[PDB]
Amino acid sequence: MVGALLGLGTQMYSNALRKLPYMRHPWEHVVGMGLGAVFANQLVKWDVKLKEDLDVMLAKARAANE
Amino acid sequence: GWGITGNKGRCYDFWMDFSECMSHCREPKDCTLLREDYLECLHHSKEFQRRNRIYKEEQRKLRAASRK
Amino acid sequence: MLEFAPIFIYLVISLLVSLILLGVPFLFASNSSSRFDIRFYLVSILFLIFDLEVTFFFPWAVSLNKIDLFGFWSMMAFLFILTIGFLYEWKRGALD
Amino acid sequence: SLVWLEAMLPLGIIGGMLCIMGNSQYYIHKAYHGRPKHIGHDEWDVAMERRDKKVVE
Amino acid sequence: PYGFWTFERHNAQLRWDPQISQV
Amino acid sequence: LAVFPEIFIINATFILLIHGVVFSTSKKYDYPPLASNVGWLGLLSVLITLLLLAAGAPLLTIAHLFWNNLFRRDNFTYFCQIFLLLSTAGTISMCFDFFDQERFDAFEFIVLILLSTCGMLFMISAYDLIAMYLAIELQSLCFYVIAASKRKSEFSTEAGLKYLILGAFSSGILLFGCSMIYGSTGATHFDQLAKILTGYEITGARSSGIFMGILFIAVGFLFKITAVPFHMWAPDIYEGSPTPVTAFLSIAPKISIFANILRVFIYGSYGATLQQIFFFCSIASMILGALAAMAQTKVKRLLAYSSIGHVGYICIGFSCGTIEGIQSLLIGIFIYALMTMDAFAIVLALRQTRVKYIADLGALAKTNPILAITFSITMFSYAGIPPLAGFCSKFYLFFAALGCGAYFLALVGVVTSVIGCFYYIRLVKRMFFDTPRTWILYEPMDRNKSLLLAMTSFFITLFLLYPSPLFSVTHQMALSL
Amino acid sequence: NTDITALEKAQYPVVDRNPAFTKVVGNFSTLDYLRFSTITGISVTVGYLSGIKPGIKGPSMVTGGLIGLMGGFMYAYQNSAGRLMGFFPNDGEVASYQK
Amino acid sequence: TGNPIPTSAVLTASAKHIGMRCMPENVAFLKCKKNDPNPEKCLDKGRDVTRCVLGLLKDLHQKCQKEMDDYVGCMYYYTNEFDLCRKEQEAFEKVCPL
Amino acid sequence: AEILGIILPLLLGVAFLVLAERKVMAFVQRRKGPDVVGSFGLLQPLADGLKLILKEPISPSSANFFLFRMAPVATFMLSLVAWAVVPFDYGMVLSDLNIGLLYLFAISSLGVYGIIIAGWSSNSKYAFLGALRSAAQMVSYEVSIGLILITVLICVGSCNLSEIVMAQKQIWFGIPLFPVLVMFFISCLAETNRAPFDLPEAEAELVAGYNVEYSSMGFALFFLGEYANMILMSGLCTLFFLGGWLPILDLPIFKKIPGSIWFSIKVLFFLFLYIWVRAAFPRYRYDQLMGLGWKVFLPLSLAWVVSVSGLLVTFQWL
Amino acid sequence: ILSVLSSLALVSGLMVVRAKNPVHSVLFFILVFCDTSGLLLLLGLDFFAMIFLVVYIGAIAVLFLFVVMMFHIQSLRYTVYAGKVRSWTNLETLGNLLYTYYFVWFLVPSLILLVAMIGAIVLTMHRTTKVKRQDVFRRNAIDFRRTIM
Amino acid sequence: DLIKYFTFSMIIFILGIWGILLNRRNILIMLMSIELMLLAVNSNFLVFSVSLDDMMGQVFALLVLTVAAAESAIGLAIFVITFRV
Amino acid sequence: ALKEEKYAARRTILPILQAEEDERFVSEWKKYLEYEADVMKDVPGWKVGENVYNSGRWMPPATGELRPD
Ligand SMILES: CCCCCCCCCCCCCCCCCC(=O)OC[C@H](COP(=O)([O-])OCC(O)COP(=O)([O-])OC[C@@H](COC(=O)CCCCCCCCCCCCCCCCC)OC(=O)CCCCCCCCCCCCCCCCC)OC(=O)CCCCCCCCCCCCCCCCC
C-alpha cells in the first residue's frame, strides 16, 4: 500500500540525513513498512470498533436519558 | 481497611457500609449519610464538636456564676 | 510502650553515672602530685542500603507463619534484587 | 591440674557481677511490686491489671 | 470501579477482623 | 500474569546489569566498555517488553490480587504504557552515538534507564497513592542518578544536583499531599478515594484537609512536569545535564506523570475545584514558553522553555474535565513526545558542538541541508504551523478549550502559539536565508537517530493525512478513565 | 486470597480457566514455539552483533539469548494462556473436545 | 483469693473450667457482641454470663478451696502466666474439677 | 533507681574484665598475669583505676568541655543502656521491650555516632581517619549481625529477647545454627574492635587513635566502654544462640538450676572465647577485614536467612 | 510533660534552616530525629521509633556528619477486651501486610534500593576501579616513537 | 490531640520548605530540609495512621522511610561528586 | 501450643470481663447522659439527649489517639 512508498522514503530520508547516498538493500525492507501500514489500517478498524463499543457503553451510562 | 493491631480496623465496617452503598446506588447522594458516618469515625468531628459545645456551655455558665 | 519508661530513666541515670565517672578524676590530683577517601562514602551508603533491607527483613522475620509461602517468596524476590545489587557491587568492586 | 583456676577467678568475679546485674534488678522490682516481673506483658495484661486494681476496690 | 467489595467480602474472614475469631 | 511487562523488564535489567558488570570488570576481555552492548540488548528488553505488553492486551487485567491492593491496569494504562515503552525505545535509540563517540563505559546508565522505565510502567498503572509515589520516586531516582552521571565536567554535576533537589522537594510536596488526603480520608486506593471525593465541592463544602492534600499533590505534579510557577530550575536542569539524559527526563516523565495526573485528578478526585490551579498553570505556562523562547539562545535551554510551554499547552486539555478535553490532552502528549524525541534526536546529532546557541546551530541549511529541513519541520511542529502535526495537537486542544467554555484559555493559547509561530518562523529564516555564522561542521548521525528523525519527520508532516488512528486511541483512553 | 477473575474476560470460549503451569506450557502451538524461537533468535543475533565491538561476541550472545529465552517464553506463555483462558482466538478447543 | 472476687488471677486461673462450663453463656454473649456492639443491647446476656461464672467461681472455691487458692497465688505471683507453675495447675485440677 | 543495680555491677564487671583478659591471655602465653597486686591480682583493676585517677593531667584544657568531654560519656552510656533489654533470667530483664532486638540494633547505630564524634573532636588527621575507619568497620559488620539476628529471629517468633531465650527450651540455636554462632561471634569480634579484627586497635594505633586530650578519664572510659561493649556483645551470643538462661534441662539432683548463674556461665564462656581468640590469631589489616565483612560474612549471612527461612517454611516449623 | 516537649523538635528544626555553622545544623538535625522518635514512641509505634533511630541517626545523619567533617562548607473509655486477647506487635502487623498483600509496594522499594546501590556506585566510584582503573590504554603499534614529534 | 501532633508536623514541613526557599545558596542545608520535610510527611503518615486506626499509613510510612533513605544516599553522593576532587 | 493455651484462657474469660466492662461503661454513660441533660437544662441545649449514633450503628464515644500504646 502507501506504506511501501513511505518506507522507501523513511530509508532514503535516513540516508539523506547521514549524508550517505540513496542506495542499498534496506529499500527492499520497506516492504516491512507496507506490512506496517496494512497493520496500522487494520488497527484503525479494530480501534474504531472498540471505541464504538465504549461509546455505546457510555450511552448506556450517563443516566440513560433519565 | 486494616488496623494497627489487626482486628478489622476501627471502621472498616463503616467503610464497608459506605462501599456497599456506593456499589448499588446510582447517585453520590442518598449514599452520603454513610459517607458522613465514615468520616465521623475517622476524625470524630461531630462527636468532638458536640463535646466541645457541652464543655463550652458548662464553662460559660460557670464563669457567669463565678464572676457574675 | 509501657516498658519504655525504665530505659527512659536509664538514659538519665547513666548520664549521671558517667558524669560522676568524669568528675572523679577532675577532683583528685591537686597541686602536688588524605584529601578524601570516597570508599568511606561507598561503605557508608552501602551500609545504609543494607540496613534498609534489614529493616525490611524484620517484619518478615517476626511474621512468617502468617505469610505462608507467599510472603516468603515475595521476600525472596526482594532478596534476589538485593543480591543482584550486591553482586553488581562486588563485581564493580566497592567491597575493598 | 587446677592451675587455670587463678585465671578463672577474674571470670568468676565478673560472672558474680552479671548474677548481681540480673538478681538486683529482679529483687528490687520484686520489692516495689509484690510479684515478679512479667515478660510477655501485652496490653491484655495491662488492661487486666487496671480492672484488677479496680476490682479489689 | 466498585472493585473493592469483591475483594473485601472475599478476604474479610481470614484476618483483620474484630470478633469472628473470638467465637 | 498481568505483570509480564514488569516481570520481564525487571529480569532483563538484572540479566543486563550482571552481564554488563561481569564483562566491564573482566581482564580476559581487556575491561571493554559495555555501553552499546548492554544497550542494544537494552532497547530490545524494551521491544520484547513492548511485545509482551502489546500482545497481552486482554491479559493485563488477568488478576484481582492486584486490583484492590496494588495497581489496576485498563485500556488507558495499556495504551499509555505501550507509548512509554515506545518513547523509551526512541530515547535509548538516540543515545547509541552518545555511548560510542562520547567516552562512556558506564553501561549501568542503560540499566538505570530500564529500571526507570519499569518505575514508569508502574506509574502509569499506579492506582494507589502509595504505588503512585513509589513508582514516581523509582523513576525520579534513576533519573537523578543518570542526570548526575558525567563527573568530569562540573556543569553536569551541579545541574544533576539541583535536579535532585527539585525532584526530592517536588516529591516531598506530592507526598505531603498524599498524607493530607490519606489522613483526611483514611483511604489511599484511587478506587476508594473516588467514592469519598464524589460531591466534595471544596469551595462550597468545608473540607480543608482534602483540599490542601489535592493542592499539594497538584503542586508536586506541576513541579515534576515542570509547569510554569514551579519549574524553578527546569531550564538549568535541561541545559547542564548531558543531552540524552535530558532527552530522557524531558519526555518520558512528562508522559508518565501526565498519565498519573489523569488517573488521580479525573478519577481519584473529579471536580472543577482543583483544575483551577491547572488553568492558571496553563495560562502562565504558555506565556512563559512563548516569552522565554523568544528570549533564549542556548538550543538546549530553548528546548527546555519550549517543553515548558508545550506542557502548558497540554494542561489546557486537563483544564476542563470533558472527554474532548482529556482526549485533547492525550493527543497533545503524543504530538509533544514524538516531536520532542525528534528535536532531541537532532540535538544529539550535533555532538561536535559544545554548549552552543542557535547562532552556532546555523549553517545547517548548508552543511547537512536535509537535517536543517528536518529541524525546521520539528520547530514548525512545536509552533503549530497548520500543515504539520503540532498544529493538530494545539488545534484540538484549543477546540476542546472552546467546547469547554474556557474561551479565555483558548485566547491566551492562540496568542502564545502565534508568538511562538513568529519566533520559530524567524528562527528558521535566520537559519536558512542568512546568518552563516562560523560554520561548525558535524560528524554524521548514525542510523538509529536517522530512522527516528526520518520516521518522526514523516509522522509530523504526514499526520493530518491520517489522524484517525491516534484520535481513536486517545478517545478510547479518555473513555476508559 | 487470589483469583484469576479478569476484567474484559472470556471474550472467547474458555478452555481451562486458570491453567496450571506445565499445562499452559504443554499447550504451546507450533506458532508459540515459533514465536518463542524467533524472539530468541532476534535476541541472540542482537546479542552477538552488539558484542562484536567490545570483543564480547560469545558471552553477549549468551546474555542476549538469556533475555530472549525469558522474553519469548513469557510471550509464548501469554499466548498459550490467553488461548487456554478465554482471551485470544483459541482454536485449540479440539484439544479438549478430543481428549 | 478471698471471696470469689473475679480478679485477673482467679479468672485466668479457672479459664479451663470457665471453658468446660459456662460455654453457652459465653457463646451467647459473643453472638450478641458480634451481632451489634452496643453495650446495652445484651446487658442481660452480660448478667447471664457473669451470673453463671460467679457461680462457677463460688463452686470452685467450695470444693478444693485450698487448691484453688494456691493456683490463684501462682497466677497473682506470675501474672497469669501458665507455664511458670504447672505443679499448682495440676494439683488444683487433679483434686476435684478436671 | 535499680539502674544502679545494673550499672555498678557492670562497672565492676568491666574493671575485672581488664584483669580477666590480661590474666587469661597471660595463662595462654605460659605466664601468670597480674598476680602481686591482689591475692591473685584481684585488686589489680582497682590499682589501674586508682592510678589513672591520681595521674595529673598533661594539660588542663577544661575549656573544650562540651565537645569531647561528653562524647566518651555518650559511648559509655550507650554501651550501658543496651544492657536494659538484656535478660539475665526469667523476668530479670530491666525493661522487657516487645521490640528489644531492634532496640539493640539502634543502640549500635548510635555507638557509631559515639565513635565518629569522639574521633572528630580529636584534631589529629591520623587519629580522625583511624576513628572513621573503626566506625566503618563497626558498621560494616552490623549488616552481618543484622542478618544473623534476622536468622535467629525467623527461628523465634518475636524480637522480645526474653522470648528469644524462651524459644530455646527445646534446643539452643547454637546447635542447629552453629555456623551462625561462629558468624555472630566473628562479627561481634569485628563489630567491637577487640578481635583478630583490630588493626585500628593495633597496640600503638589505638591509643593515638581515639583522642588527643587523654587526662586518663578518656583512656579509662574508652576501655571501660570497649569492655562493656564486649560483655554486652558476649551477652548476645548467649541470649540468641546459647540458651539465655536455660540449662541443658537434664534436671540434675546436684544442680538446683539457677537461671542467672547459667547466663553468667555462658557469658563467661564467650568472654573467655574473646580472650583466647585474641591471643591465638594474627590481626586482619582492616583491608582484608572490610573485605571479609562484605565478601564473606554478608553472603554467608544472607544465605543463612534464606536457609533458615526455607527449611522452616517448607516444613511448617515457624 | 514529655508530650508537649515536641517543642524541642520544633526549635531544632528551625535551627537547621537558620544556621551557618554546619556542625550545629547536623547536630540539630540529629536532635530533630531524636525528638521525632520520642514522639513516635509516645504514639506507641515502637518499630518506627527504632527505624527512625537506625536508618536516620545511624545512617543518614552519619552521611551528613561525613559531609560536614570532610568537605566543610565554610473515666469514659469502654475498653473492648476483644482484640486484646492476641496483641499484635507492630512488626507482626506490618509483616502481615507488607510482604503478602501490598507486596509490590515492597518489591518496588526493593528496586529503589537497588537503584540507590547502582547510583552510589556509578556516582561515587570516583574513577577508583574498573571505571577508569582499566588502564591508561596506551598501545605501541599505534605510536610513532617520537622520532617525528 | 491529633491536631497537636499534625499541625506540629505541618509546621515542621513548613520549616523544611522555608529552608528550601532561603538556602538556594547552600545545598547541604537544602538536603537537610529535604529530609526534614520527608520526615514531617513521614511522621505525618504515622500520626494519621494511629488516629484513623489504619495500617496503610504505617506501610506507606515504612516505604517512605526506605525511599527517603535511598534519596538521601543518592543526594549526598551527588553532593560529594559536586565538590569534585 | 502454649500461646494457644494462653489465648484460649483469655478468650474464655473474655465474656466475663466484657460484661463487667459493659455494666461499668453503661453506668458511666447513664451518668454522663444525666450530666448532659443537667448541664443543658433540656430547654436550650441539645433537644435530643444522647443522639450520638449519627447512623444506624454504635461506637465507643471518643478519646485521644492511643492510650494503651
Ligand atoms: C525489487 C527487488 C526485491 C528483492 C527481494 C528483497 C528481499 C529482502 C531484501 C533484504 C531485506 C533485509 C536484509 C537483512 C537486513 C540488512 C541490514 C543492513 O542493511 O545491514 C547494514 C550493515 C551496516 O553495517 P555493517 O556493514 O553490518 O557493519 C557493522 C558496523 O560496524 C556497525 O558499527 P559497530 O562496529 O559499532 O557495530 C555495532 C553493531 C550493532 O548491531 C546491532 O546492534 C544490530 C541490531 C539491529 C536490530 C536487529 C537486526 C537483526 C534482526 C532483524 C529483524 C528480523 C525479523 C524480521 C524483521 C523485523 C523488523 C526489522 O552494528 C552493526 O552494524 C551490527 C550488524 C548490523 C546488521 C544487523 C542486521 C542483520 C542481521 C539480521 C538479519 C535480519 C534480516 C531482516 C529481514 C527484514 C525483512 C523481513 O551492513 C551489513 O550488514 C552488510 C551485510 C549484510 C547485508 C547483505 C546483503 C543483503 C542480503 C539480502 C538482500 C536481498 C534483496 C536483494 C534486492 C536486490 C535489489 C536491490
Task: Tell me what the CATH architecture of chain K is.
Answer: Orthogonal Bundle
Q: Could you tell me which ligands this complex binds, including any ions or cofactors?
A: cardiolipin
Reading the helices and strands of chain J in chain order gives HHHHHH
Q: From the helix content, strand content and strand pairing of chain J, which structural class follows?
A: mainly alpha
Q: What is the rounded distance between the termini of chain J?
A: 82 Å
The largest sheet of chain J, given as strand count, sense and whether it forms a barrel, is: none
Choose one word for the global shape of chain K: flat
Instruction: Let me know the largest β-sheet of chain K.
Output: none
Proportion of strand residues of chain J: under 5%
How many E strands of chain J? 0
SSE series of chain K: HHHH
Secondary structure category of chain K: mainly alpha
Number of strands of chain K: 0
What is the multimeric organization of the chains shown? part of a larger assembly
PDB class: membrane protein
Keywords: Respiration, Complex I, mitochondria, plant, membrane protein
Entry title: Plant mitochondrial respiratory complex I
Chain A: B14.5b
Describe what you observe in this structure.
- This is part of a larger assembly, with 12 protein chains of 12 kinds.
- With 96 residues, chain C is mainly α.
- Chain C is built from 3 helices and no strands.
- Chain C has a single domain, classed as Methane Monooxygenase Hydroxylase, Chain G, domain 1.
- The radius of gyration of chain I is 20 Å and the shape is globular.
- Chain I starts with a helix and ends with a helix.
- The relative contact order of chain I is 0.14.
- Chain K has a single domain (3-82), classed as Helix Hairpins, CATH 1.10.287.
- In chain K, 86% of the residues lie in helices and 0% in strands.
- Bound molecules: cardiolipin (CDL).
- Cardiolipin sits between chains A (24-26, 28-29, 32) and G (42, 45-46, 49-50, 53).
